[PDB]
Amino acid sequence: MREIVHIQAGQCGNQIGAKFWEVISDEHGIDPTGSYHGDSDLQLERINVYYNEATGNKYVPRAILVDLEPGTMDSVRSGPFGQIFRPDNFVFGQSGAGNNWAKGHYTEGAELVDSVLDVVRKESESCDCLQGFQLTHSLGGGTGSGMGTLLISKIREEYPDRIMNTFSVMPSPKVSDTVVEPYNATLSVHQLVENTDETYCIDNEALYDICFRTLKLTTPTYGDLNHLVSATMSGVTTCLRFPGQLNADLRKLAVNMVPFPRLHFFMPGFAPLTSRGSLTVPELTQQMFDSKNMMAACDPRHGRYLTVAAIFRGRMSMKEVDEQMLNVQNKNSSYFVEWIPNNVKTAVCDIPPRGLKMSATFIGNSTAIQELFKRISEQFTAMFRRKAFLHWYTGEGMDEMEFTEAESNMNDLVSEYQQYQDAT
Amino acid sequence: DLGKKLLEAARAGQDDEVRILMANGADVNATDASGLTPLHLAATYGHLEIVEVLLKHGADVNAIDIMGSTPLHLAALIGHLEIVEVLLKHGADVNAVDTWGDTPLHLAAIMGHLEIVEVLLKHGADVNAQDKFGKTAFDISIDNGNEDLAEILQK
Amino acid sequence: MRECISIHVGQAGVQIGNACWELYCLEHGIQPDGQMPSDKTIGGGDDSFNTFFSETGAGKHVPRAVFVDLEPTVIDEVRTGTYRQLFHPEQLITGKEDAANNYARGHYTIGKEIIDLVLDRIRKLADQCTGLQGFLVFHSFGGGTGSGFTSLLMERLSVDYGKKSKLEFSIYPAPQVSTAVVEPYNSILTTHTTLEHSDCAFMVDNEAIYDICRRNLDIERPTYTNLNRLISQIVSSITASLRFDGALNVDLTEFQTNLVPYPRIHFPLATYAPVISAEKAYHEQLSVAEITNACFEPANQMVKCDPRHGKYMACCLLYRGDVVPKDVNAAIATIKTKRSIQFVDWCPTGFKVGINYQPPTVVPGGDLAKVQRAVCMLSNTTAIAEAWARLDHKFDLMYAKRAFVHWYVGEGMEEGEFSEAREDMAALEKDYEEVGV
Numbered sequence A: 001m002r003e004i005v006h007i008q009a010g011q012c013g014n015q016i017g018a019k020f021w022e023v024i025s026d027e028h029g030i031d032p033t034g035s036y037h038g039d040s041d042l043q044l045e046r047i048n049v050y051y052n053e054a055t056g057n058k059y060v061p062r063a064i065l066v067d068l069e070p071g072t073m074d075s076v077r078s079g080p081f082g083q084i085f086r087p088d089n090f091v092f093g094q095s096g097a098g099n100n101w102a103k104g105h106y107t108e109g110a111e112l113v114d115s116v117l118d119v120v121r122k123e124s125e126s127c128d129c130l131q132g133f134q135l136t137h138s139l140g141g142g143t144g145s146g147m148g149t150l151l152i153s154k155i156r157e158e159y160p161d162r163i164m165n166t167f168s169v170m171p172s173p174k175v176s177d178t179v180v181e182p183y184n185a186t187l188s189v190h191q192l193v194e195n196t197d198e199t200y201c202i203d204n205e206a207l208y209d210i211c212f213r214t215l216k217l218t219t220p221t222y223g224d225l226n227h228l229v230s231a232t233m234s235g236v237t238t239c240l241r242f243p244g245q246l247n248a249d250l251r252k253l254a255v256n257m258v259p260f261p262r263l264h265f266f267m268p269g270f271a272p273l274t275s276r277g278s279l280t281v282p283e284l285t286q287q288m289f290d291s292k293n294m295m296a297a298c299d300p301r302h303g304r305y306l307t308v309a310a311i312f313r314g315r316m317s318m319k320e321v322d323e324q325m326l327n328v329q330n331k332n333s334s335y336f337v338e339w340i341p342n343n344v345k346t347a348v349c350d351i352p353p354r355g356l357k358m359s360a361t362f363i364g365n366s367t368a369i370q371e372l373f374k375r376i377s378e379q380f381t382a383m384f385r386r387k388a389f390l391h392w393y394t395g396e397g398m399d400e401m402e403f404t405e406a407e408s409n410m411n412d413l414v415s416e417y418q419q420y421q422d423a424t
Numbered sequence B: 001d002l003g004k005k006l007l008e009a010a011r012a013g014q015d016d017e018v019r020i021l022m023a024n025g026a027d028v029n030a031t032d033a034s035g036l037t038p039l040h041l042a043a044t045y046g047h048l049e050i051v052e053v054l055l056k057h058g059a060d061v062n063a064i065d066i067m068g069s070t071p072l073h074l075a076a077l078i079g080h081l082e083i084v085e086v087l088l089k090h091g092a093d094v095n096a097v098d099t100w101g102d103t104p105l106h107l108a109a110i111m112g113h114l115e116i117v118e119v120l121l122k123h124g125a126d127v128n129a130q131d132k133f134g135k136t137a138f139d140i141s142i143d144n145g146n147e148d149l150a151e152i153l154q155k
Numbered sequence C: 001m002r003e004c005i006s007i008h009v010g011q012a013g014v015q016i017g018n019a020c021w022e023l024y025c026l027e028h029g030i031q032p033d034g035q036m037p038s039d040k041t042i043g044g045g046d047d048s049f050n051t052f053f054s055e056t057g058a059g060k061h062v063p064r065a066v067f068v069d070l071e072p073t074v075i076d077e078v079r080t081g082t083y084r085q086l087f088h089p090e091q092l093i094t095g096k097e098d099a100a101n102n103y104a105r106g107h108y109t110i111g112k113e114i115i116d117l118v119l120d121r122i123r124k125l126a127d128q129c130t131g132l133q134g135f136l137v138f139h140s141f142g143g144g145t146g147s148g149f150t151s152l153l154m155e156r157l158s159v160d161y162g163k164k165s166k167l168e169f170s171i172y173p174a175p176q177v178s179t180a181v182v183e184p185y186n187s188i189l190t191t192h193t194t195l196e197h198s199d200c201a202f203m204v205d206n207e208a209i210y211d212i213c214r215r216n217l218d219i220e221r222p223t224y225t226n227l228n229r230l231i232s233q234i235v236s237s238i239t240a241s242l243r244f245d246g247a248l249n250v251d252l253t254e255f256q257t258n259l260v261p262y263p264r265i266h267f268p269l270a271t272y273a274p275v276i277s278a279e280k281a282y283h284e285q286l287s288v289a290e291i292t293n294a295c296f297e298p299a300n301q302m303v304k305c306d307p308r309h310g311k312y313m314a315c316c317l318l319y320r321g322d323v324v325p326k327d328v329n330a331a332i333a334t335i336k337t338k339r340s341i342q343f344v345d346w347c348p349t350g351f352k353v354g355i356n357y358q359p360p361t362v363v364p365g366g367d368l369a370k371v372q373r374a375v376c377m378l379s380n381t382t383a384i385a386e387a388w389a390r391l392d393h394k395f396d397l398m399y400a401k402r403a404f405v406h407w408y409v410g411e412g413m414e415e416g417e418f419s420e421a422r423e424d425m426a427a428l429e430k431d432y433e434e435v436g437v
Ligand SMILES: Nc1nc2c(ncn2[C@@H]2O[C@H](COP(=O)(O)OP(=O)(O)OP(=O)(O)O)[C@@H](O)[C@H]2O)c(=O)[nH]1
Pocket: C009, C010, C011, C012, C013, C015, C016, C069, C070, C098, C099, C100, C101, C102, C106, C140, C141, C142, C143, C144, C145, C146, C147, C171, C172, C173, C174, C177, C178, C179, C180, C183, C206, C224, C227, C228, C231
């Protein structure tokens, strides 16, 4: 089908969301003012998926911006494409959430959630046939994690037949030395297992490791990390925005990629890796299955692919991709499950990103993602066993039993992943 | 009973109140219902100056709560580097073991406070120390693929 | 003259349908606007081509056909294509949201939103007929619309048109060009629910057609466009007997009489020869004996299987072009001893022969060379059981773990329908075994 409504919530959600819109606007010939300056009609066929058409032939992003911290509003406005979002679509509270999931989910964030829903309804009713939602956020803070999961749940209550898709940035001690973030992410994962159809797991442990160890950036910044994110989000949404041959939408993605309802957490991957200032088809198909090119800090060779999608971008032989994908699928045979036949899908798109002649984007549903959940589970449990700072949460009305249940659900998820790794 | 007030003052970083209570006979080694001392809470919540005044007034730097946690355990878990160093300078047992078999080194590694890991190694933390699951600090770094930690632990 | 209505369901059915009707037009001398200078009877007629084309009175010849798809993208290409003026607008029907590769969405939820509109539009076409004989239904096995909506449609047509024949052209999935991982599920589900309702079904194995484009036509990477022009040549050869004078397969009932000895084993095999690249324009022409031999080579089959394994129950050979009946008899006489061809003991070993003395048409822009003679063989051989077995194996692998089943249960289907459909395929495979394979 067609239209997607995008919500970005909290600091990380808004910072990576803003870069997403700068990146695809340049790909679609949209300028900071909104006017179309492209030289190819292929940029306009499916522009309706992400942009509404305004009077005077100007395209406004189907984008909703929410935070409990008003300071985020001014920052997005002060960006280059900051004067393109609908001012009516800015929804900002008074006091933030102070990295407190419970303030996002139960108190401060709950008070604002009706106002966000009003603009979601307005943006939804003006869609010909809305296919679903996307949400950008971090799991480690208070607003994106706490208020984001609340907003997801109320949306899924009111739009139970539409697809809910998230880009969810997982915390790393290497990037944020804030010890309550295992709490916030675990409590959110509990909700995400139940209330999203498909979740892209973007891991700041991966992004930092990529910049530092591979890109030689001695001191990575959020700008450096989000350059990686922006390339990934552009890649995974390529089929949604250009014609190609995959009549692309989010629900077909879910049907083909998610064999079991809870195992809907994707490991993305990108090639080539590049910095913010600085290839053959066989080199791409090899990098795409390399652990160092994943955006989730785990080893695909420690598990088994259930389902995989690739998107090649640029000018290349359809046969050369088909042949190389065949090759990679033969040498790595013991890393694909054998009870889902034909479980690797290739897409090709003529239009490459900016500054690249050819790129590849990987989307994998792999049992190896349990290593990310195991990592967060260990850190959650270390803090939880000493009950460190638990009163910051219970003081907002949370019951302590909500921690053990989130912890039990995450260990159940790691187990479910292991079962289908073992299966034959 | 001034012990309950010292406990709250130490948690909330109220330096003035801590001094006043100690001068009026407050039990520096009072415990809450779980066995935490004022030193436990000052180390937990990062109040360096309160840690230092408590240690000049008879705090047991190696007190344990009912779970076996020392102040050094909690400082290493939460990541309060300057307090870790003060605790070691005043006699903390670098290899104290809690009821999960965790040492401070285990906790600092798990939480990724790499500066604290280096500090503890340089004071004799036991790299062979196993938790109740058999895991050493090095085991954690391998099962998590934390290459920075594993490098640190090889010195 | 008795009328046939064609129904094209989903992307595969619509795109192949567009290819077939173009070729039909070229065969009969109908222009893209519906004008037919050769029809001396204006506004009416009882000629053989009227089984497929009605007439308006201003001289327009209009396909007896309806296109349907649950989203608009593919039918919009017919509305704006070269033959846009050919079809009535009201016989091109679209929803706004597809079945998402999910049989249950096409059958139970989304498909129920459009089924009554589709039945009413079909009724209008049927009301124009004076002796409707039945329906030719084109669809994929793999799509949510092609599988799920087609079985819903087939159920309703059996209630509203109990006495009429229903034939299928069905696209069987192949890994090379497939779209979804759950296509084995959709294939078995629709097969199960359509079986009682379909009298004869011609399966087109996308792998077989792909391999023919690569081998015979030298197309390194065939696309849908190449596959569909080839498939349309074969569909035309099957339906030519319905559209022209002849003495074999002259109405829908005779298809069944000739090719379906028992109702459930109603899946005949089509073979076609010669397929020659349009770059070989001056090629030496092949004799009747040569092209007839070629029909017993597995590589020329529209479904991948090995007929030398199984056993024949029926065999019709339909010739087009410069074909002398005595030369066919001599060809058949040879291909009864020098090849491993075994009929079932309870069936006559007779081959049925029909000849149309006009050579086949090629579409401009196509991949095929003009030929002076060509042949399509339709057979019912137990060897087609191999196609079902390869399908059932893939199904079984995923269903044992219940992979993807929740997407179907979430769309109003009960999980017991999975087991009952697979049990039906087990019975169908055994049906072929008893006869002999
Ligand atoms: N031969 C041929 N096969 C096609 C064509 N289009 C799609 N297919 C095949 O049909 C199957 C996919 O089903 P579709 O017909 O695309 O699905 P649909 O009926 O439109 O149903 P939805 O799920 O609602 O999109 C795959 O096996 C494709 O390879 C075509 O034009 N020609």
